[PDB]
Design a protein around this ligand. Structure first.
Ligand SMILES: NC(=[NH2+])NCCC[C@H](NC(=O)[C@@H](N)Cc1ccc(O)cc1)C(=O)O
Ligand SMILES: [Mg+2]
Ligand SMILES: [Mg+2]
Ligand SMILES: [Mg+2]
Length: 76
């Protein structure tokens, strides 16, 4: 089963920072990163990447080091 990395809205990080982090960590374009940031902000969370459990563990670690609230879970 594939897994997903989820980023959760938090009250401290800047919207602008989160958009930048998605570009920096995943290479996403600015429209893509902005859309994911706004999904987190307006829905409370968003899937930001998908793949094997092991690969999502890395994405979670990278996001934590950037200061974002990230978890992973199995995709159903
Ligand atoms: N640094 C700072 N001024 N903090 C106060 C809040 C700033 C505000 N940020 C938000 O509204 C965030 N909730 C946006 C956000 C955080 C995390 C994630 O993952 C997505 C979105 C602002 O930017 O004005
Ligand atoms: Mg907010
Ligand atoms: Mg966060
Ligand atoms: Mg799903």
């Amino acid at each position: 089963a594939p897994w997903v990395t989820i980023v959760w809205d938090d009250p401290v990080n800047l919207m602008s920072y989160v958009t930048y982090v998605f570009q920096k960590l995943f290479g996403y374009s600015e429209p893509h990163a902005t859309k994911l940031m706004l999904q987190v902000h307006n829905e409370g969370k968003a899937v930001v990447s998908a793949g094997s459990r092991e690969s999502m563990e890395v994405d979670v670690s990278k996001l934590h080091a950037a200061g974002l609230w990230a978890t992973m879970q199995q995709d159903r």
